[PDB]
Amino acid sequence: KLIGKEALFVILGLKRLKEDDEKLDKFIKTHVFRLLKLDMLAVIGELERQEETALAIKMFEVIQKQEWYQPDVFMYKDLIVSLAKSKRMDEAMALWEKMKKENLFPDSQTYTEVIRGFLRDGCPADAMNVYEDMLKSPDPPEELPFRVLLKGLLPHPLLRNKVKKDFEELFPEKHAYDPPEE
């Protein structure tokens, strides 16, 4: 992608001061608060990609305070997925709960990516939580998230069988000629 000069200066400075709480906070107040919207999104996106999740959480906190801020599912998705990839499952789940409270609407790929993230980290309970949220979505569920779950839940046949049963009951016709279980 595409990272401007101010955004790049901030990213290098945050990573530089990462372990000094004192210097970091002053740097944030001095160089990060003035960032324009596009540049803040650019900085949090790069931190998330690099899995500098502690700095990303700080950026998200600054962002929420901005005059232009409006809760966005993708902004939450990106952070949660970065957290799961860094094995901060509790922080990730907590952000997912906060997202739900803001009444946002994950698309199917969002449910699926979060679920894959939790399963990868060996957290079936968290995956199932997101799965149960997916079943309550306004949208009808797509099959892909079920295939992910059934393959990630082999070591946990009670969870896997429950998912398998939710599918057959939700897609009687589709279960028949296209098993996600298979």
Instruction: Encode 18-27: b = buried (16+ Cβ within 10 Å), e = exposed.
Output: eeeeeebeeb
Amino acid 173 reads E
CATH number of the domain bearing residue 86:
1.25.40.10
Quote the domain boundaries for residue 53.
1-182
CA geometry: angle 69, 70, 73, nearest 5 deg? 125
In the three-class reduction of DSSP (H, G, I as helix; E, B as strand; rest coil), residue 59 is classed as: helix
CA 77 from centroid of its chain's CA atoms: 3
What domain count does the chain have? 1
Given a contact cutoff of 8 angstroms between Cβ atoms, the answer to whether 119 and 148 are in contact is yes
The sign one gets for the Cα dihedral 135, 138, 144, 148 is negative
Distance, CA of 60 to CA of 171 (rounded, Å):
39
Distance, CA of 34 to CA of 156 (rounded, Å):
49
